[PDB]
Every structure is written in structure tokens, then in C-alpha cells.
Amino acid sequence: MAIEEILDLEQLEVNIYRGSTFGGHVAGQSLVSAVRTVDPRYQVHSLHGYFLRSGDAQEPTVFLVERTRDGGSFVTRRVNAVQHGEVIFSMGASFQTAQNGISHQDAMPAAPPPLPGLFEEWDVRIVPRDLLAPLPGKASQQQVWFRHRDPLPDDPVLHICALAYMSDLTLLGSAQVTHLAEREHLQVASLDHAMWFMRGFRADEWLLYDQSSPSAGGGRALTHGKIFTQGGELVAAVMQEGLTRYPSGYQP
């Protein structure tokens, strides 16, 4: 419903696009920018970016694409998302031809099926704390089931660009599971994003976002996610650092 239009950019020129703020939204449209400059024989397999500034949600965003390399097997792009002459998000992305190699996969974690409910167009559901299967020595775990209510066209771009989008949705939350108490004294915001796209999925079908936050300190927390189809496939991996900061005066 909404997500298609969010990711439908206007081309202003070669390597110049416009989308008409949720971090995932800037992220997703930056990725679409990149993709629309790459031969579709090459499909995206990773992205890295820094959230530099807060978006103005009431204004368009211009995307300036750089064609970093174009080789035989991999193509690489950088995107700067701009508003009011300032870069709000700066991204890299890599793309590869269909090729062959070694195969393996971590098994899907223990999770209940989809459950309570955490973006009207998405069906999002959190695992309640007493239904969570602990794993050894891990301080802070969160499982989230999501999926698009309405079916979506089969375009892999859309599905990947949509997954980029939803991936910024609950992940940083996982860092505050054991800190419910200091949740009115935290400055919170995404600092970065890194994603690896490994396998196909129906984004209109159930996805498990298994999340963890292995560390917090110095006013930051790191989070880590794994995305799975109900049948046990690893679709993507995500890492995200975020601001989790006490004000200048405040001590716990």
C-alpha cells in the first residue's frame, strides 16, 4: 500500500533522484537510488550507511548517486541523501551477478509462531518476555514477527528495499529490554546501518526478526539481527549501532 509509493523515486537526472523522519525511509530510498543506476543482472548483497542528521519529514529528499566501480562480477555505489544542502544519510552498497560457491546456514532459532502485536500496512508482533528462549550468556534478546498485510509484486528490489526499511523498525529496541527503568532519560537515535542480503523471500509472508544487543556503553548500544522465513531460511543479517545516552547531568 504505502511502501511502494515511498520507494517510487522521481529521476531528476542521471545519478540524481528525488523521494517525496523514519530512518528506514531515508535508508530505503537511498538503496532504491543505488539500484536504479545498476544493471539488473547484478543484485544487491550488502549496504553500509551513517545517519548523519535528522531528516525533515515535511520535505523531499534528493539522492546523489556515485558509480564507484563497475566490474565483471561486482558493482559498487555510494549515495548521499540530501536536504537543505546537507547530507542526512551517506550509504555504500555492493551488487553481484548470480554466481556459485560454498553453502551453509545457521539453523533458525527457537521462536513461538505468530501473539500480541508491537505502519498500519504491516503486521508486526513482539515476542513476550516469558516466551523467549534464552541463549547462553546473552544480555538482551528480542524476537519480532513481521509481514506486509497486503500481498506485494514479485520485484526483488522492492522486497529488498522494503526489508531495508522494516529492518530499522524494531532493531535498536532490543538494546533497551533490560533498561526499562532509564527509558525516560535516554537520548536515542540510529547511528549506522549494515545489511547483508543472502536469500529470496515473500515479504508478504511471515518473517522472524531475531534480535540481540551484545553491548552498550559510552552512550551507545550495538544491535544485531537475523531475518528468517518461517520455513527456516536466513534472508538477511543486520547490524546497527545507536545513540543511547544520558543527559549531561544525569547519573543512574
Q: Rule CB under 8 A: which of 165-184 touch a second copy? A: 175-176, 178-179, 182
By CB under 8 A, the residues from 130 to 169 that bind a second copy are 133, 135-140
Cβ neighbours, 10 Å, residue 179: 16
The three grid cell numbers given for residue 149, joined into one nine-digit string: 498485510
Q: Would you call 168 a catalytic residue per the annotation?
A: yes
Interaction between residue 215 and a second copy (CB under 8 A) = yes
Q: What, of a second copy, Na ion, none, does residue 108 touch, CB below 5 to 8 Å by kind? A: a second copy
Residues near Na ion (CB under 5 A) are 35, 38, 40, 71-74
By CB under 8 A, the residues from 5 to 34 that bind a second copy are none
Residue 69 bridge partners (DSSP) = 76
Four-CA torsion 105, 111, 115, 120, nearest 10 degrees: -20
Given 13, 100, 120, 184, the residue binding a second copy (CB under 8 A): 100
Whole-angstrom Cα distance, residue 131 to residue 145?
13
Residues in the chain: 252
Residue 192 bridge partners (DSSP) = 50
Interaction between residue 214 and a second copy (CB under 8 A) = yes
Interaction between residue 194 and a second copy (CB under 8 A) = yes
Nearer to Na ion, 56 or 150 (CB): 56
Whole-angstrom Cα distance, residue 213 to residue 236?
17
Instruction: Provide the phi-psi class of 178: left if phi over 0, else alpha when psi is between -120 and 50, else beta.
Output: alpha
Position closest to Na ion via CB = 71
Catalytic residue among 29, 83, 168, 174: 168
Nearer to a second copy, 138 or 149 (CB): 138
CB of 104 to a second copy, least distance (A): 4
Q: Quick one: how far is CA 126 from the chain centroid?
A: 17
Interface characters, 36-65, with a second copy (x: CB under 8 A): ---------xx-xxx-xx------------
Which candidate, 196, 193, 178, 18, places its Cα nearest to that of 96?
A: 196
Which candidate, 88, 36, 93, places its Cα nearest to that of 62?
A: 88
By CB under 8 A, the residues from 222 to 241 that bind a second copy are 222, 224, 226, 234, 237, 239, 241
**Residues designated catalytic:** 168, 190, 240
